[PDB]
Amino acid sequence: RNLRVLLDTAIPPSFCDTVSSVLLDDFNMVSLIRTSPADSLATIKQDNAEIDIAITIDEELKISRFNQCVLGYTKAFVVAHPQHPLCNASLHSIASLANYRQISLGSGQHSNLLRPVSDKVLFVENFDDMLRLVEAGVGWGIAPHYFVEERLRNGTLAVLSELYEPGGIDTKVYCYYNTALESERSFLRFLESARQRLRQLGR
Numbered sequence: 001r002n003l004r005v006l007l008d009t010a011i012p013p014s015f016c017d018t019v020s021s022v023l024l025d026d027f028n029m030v031s032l033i034r035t036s037p038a039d040s041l042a043t044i045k046q047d048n049a050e051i052d053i054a055i056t057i058d059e060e061l062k063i064s065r066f067n068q069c070v071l072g073y074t075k076a077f078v079v080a081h082p083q084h085p086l087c088n089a090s091l092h093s094i095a096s097l098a099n100y101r102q103i104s105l106g107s108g109q110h111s112n113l114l115r116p117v118s119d120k121v122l123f124v125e126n127f128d129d130m131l132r133l134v135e136a137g138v139g140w141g142i143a144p145h146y147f148v149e150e151r152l153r154n155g156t157l158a159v160l161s162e163l164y165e166p167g168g169i170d171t172k173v174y175c176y177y178n179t180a181l182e183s184e185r186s187f188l189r190f191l192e193s194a195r196q197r198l199r200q201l202g203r
């Protein structure tokens with residue numbers, strides 16, 4: 001039949017392409033859906049979408065009709081305008097940043113992972129709007145690598161996360177599979193080949 005797969009906006013495009021490619025190799029019919037991780041898990045939970053597989057970074061252990069696995073990792077950066085107040089410290093820390101405002105994603109309840117670090121916050125609905133605001137000094141934010149690679153190699157934006165996690169904040173990328181699919185050798189073959197290829201990318 002059709003299998004439907006969700007991937008969030010934090011999943012780098014090489015990642016999304018690698019997954020899709022393997023699925024079409026080991027599945028007949030593949031429909032791809034994209035949402036922000038908060039709406040990633042909410043969306044699969046709605047049950048009206050008939051999402052069979054979801055690849056996101058948001059964590060929830062007991063979900064109905066869905067099991068969990070780790071598919072790999074992605075990296076994320078705390079970014080902010082170079083002339084944002086914060087940049088002048090040179091040694092920025094989660095306490096030093098809790099005073100200044102965070103553009104954060106939120107689309108009503110919130111997960112722990114995507115919980116805001118600050119009392120002064122502003123919710124945005126996608127990453128492009130987050131970064132437009134950040135680039136206007138409105139606040140600071142947590143964005144994926146693939147999104148801000150260019151604005152950081154261009155000096156447009158800066159990084160404050162090189163004390164917390166040098167190199168980027170290594171987040172897990174989870175695969176939330178529908179329970180039934182566990183019994184299809186196809187799902188397992190997808191899983192094997194994907195996990196391998198993604199690690200091969202990591203080099």
Ligand SMILES: FC(F)(F)c1cc(NCc2cnc(-c3ccc(C4CC4)cc3)s2)ccn1
Pocket residue numbers: 010057075076077078092093094095097113114115117142143144145160161164169171
């Ligand atoms: F889409 C992703 F870009 F992948 C993503 C990843 C993500 N990880 C959980 C975290 C939340 N706050 C963190 C943090 C870690 C270090 C700092 C230091 C002070 C600068 C601040 C906040 S890490 C959350 C949202 N979005």
